[PDB]
UniProtKB/Swiss-Prot annotation:
Residues 125-293 form the ATP-grasp domain. It holds the Pfam family GSH-S_ATP. This is Glutathione synthetase. It comes from the Bacteria. It comes from Escherichia coli (strain K12). Signal peptide: none annotated. Changing residue 223 to V: Loss of activity. Homotetramer. Binds 1 Mg(2+) or Mn(2+) ion per subunit. Keywords: ATP-binding, Glutathione biosynthesis, Ligase, Magnesium, Manganese, Metal-binding, Nucleotide-binding. The gene is gshB. Its EC number is 6.3.2.3. Belongs to the prokaryotic GSH synthase family.
Amino acid sequence: MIKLGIVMDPIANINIKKDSSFAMLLEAQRRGYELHYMEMGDLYLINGEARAHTRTLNVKQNYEEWFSFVGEQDLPLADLDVILMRKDPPFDTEFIYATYILERAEEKGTLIVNKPQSLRDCNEKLFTAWFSDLTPETLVTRNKAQLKAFWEKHSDIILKPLDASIFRVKEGDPNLGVIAETLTEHGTRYCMAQNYLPAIKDGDKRVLVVDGEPVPYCLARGGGGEPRPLTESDWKIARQIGPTLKEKGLIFVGLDIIGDRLTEINVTSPTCIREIEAEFPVSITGMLMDAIEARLQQQ
């Protein structure tokens, strides 16, 4: 049938209660796919060939034993029909080099759920530089003198590292200096600066997109988790980003919407699946897998 691999962080350590990857696995299993489990380190490249040491995976909703290995083989990634890259950030050289490996398989027919080139191209933070009109005032620099001006120009702003650890730098803030100095490491690393949107008060909204189609229910993070229907402005945004997602082969994405402003695009390991699923008649995992099987046919 379909032989789907997954590349992820130790299954031994996920929490099956909130883990979105695991939600996928349950769904593919239910559909009668054969599952192959890999880790960064199982990925190898021998003379131009992507190969891996996989384990055959059986997952089950069981807190005492959610997974089990039922086989193990070394093979060509090109044997798998689809591989889900579900590695948690940060985006390091290690992730980038892995995308080169996943990409050799792809050239030999495997489908990579998020396309490898696409993962290099779309920084989680910097992709938003291509969606100017939908995001907040954003500055990306190494110069303290620029952060400071930005701050003078906006009074209240968000400071963050490109690779949460967000600094809210308000009027009266005695520390911009040290922050700049800290985040850019004495001006040798780039850092992002952004004006603050008090709208996060109303919650930090996480919206999912499956092959360009926004899931109609989102997750707000404004004190606790609270799913809800997409606002008229959620459609609007997702609606505008969507086409680019589909064509860049970014088949499963998370959007971080703060108010009516797009703050970030999660292309690596977007989550929040189980949260919405509990509360609404929606199978996000089923959409995804629907999207996979169909891509699988076209190509």
